[PDB]
Swiss-Prot record, chain A:
Minor capsid protein essential for stable capsid assembly of complete particles. The keyword Glycosyltransferase does not apply. InterPro entries: Tecti-min-caps. GO terms for biological process: viral capsid assembly. This is Minor capsid protein P30. Dimer. Keywords: Capsid protein, Virion. It is found in: Virion. GO terms for cellular component: viral capsid. The gene is XXX.
Curated annotation (Swiss-Prot), chain B:
The gene is III. This is Major capsid protein P3. The chain holds residues 248 to 297 of 395 of the full protein. Homotrimer. It is found in: Virion. Major capsid protein self-assembles to form an icosahedral capsid with a pseudo T=25 symmetry, about 66 nm in diameter, and consisting of 240 capsid proteins trimers. The capsid encapsulates an inner membrane and the genomic dsDNA genome. The major coat protein P3 and two assembly factors (P10 and P17) are needed during the assembly of the virus particle inside the host cell, when the capsid protein multimers are capable of enclosing the host-derived membrane, containing the virus-encoded membrane-associated proteins.
Length: 83, 50
């Protein structure tokens, strides 16, 4: 702010002001609020809580069976070298 | 005395048929998982014309 003498800035907005209204009042709000609809315990989703496999491992079962059977052919006898 | 991996692996040949081809559009036949595909043969039976 600058004040300049001799033209000085009025020393106030004075008493000639026009009170325009008495509408100043905010009427307090008084209220009762009830949000009470029956609630049912459940919601349907496509899927909740699953941690789906991105790849599975290979998996398997097992079997064996049979017996011990055989047809054989042997090497001929040979002269013994030494000993 | 037996090799166990050889006998628990399967070496198979299998065929299938797919349709829905359209000119200039990529027709894709997906490979399944788990299988180790050694070769692929595709025969374009173009409505009886080869």
């Amino acid at each position: 702010a600058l004040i300049n003498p001799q033209f000085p800035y009025a020393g106030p907005v004075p008493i000639p002001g026009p009170a325009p209204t008495e509408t100043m009042p905010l009427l307090n709000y008084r209220v009762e609020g009830r949000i009470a609809g029956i609630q049912q315990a459940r919601q349907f989703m496509p899927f909740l809580q699953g941690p789906h496999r991105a790849v599975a491992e290979q998996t398997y079962h097992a079997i064996g069976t049979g017996i011990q059977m055989g047809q054989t052919f042997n090497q001929p006898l040979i002269n013994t070298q030494e000993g | 005395i037996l090799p166990l991996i050889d006998l628990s692996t399967l070496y198979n040949l299998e065929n299938s048929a797919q349709a829905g081809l359209t000119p200039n559009v990529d027709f894709v036949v997906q490979y399944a998982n788990l299988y180790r595909y050694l070769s692929t043969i595709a025969v374009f039976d173009n409505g009886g014309s080869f």
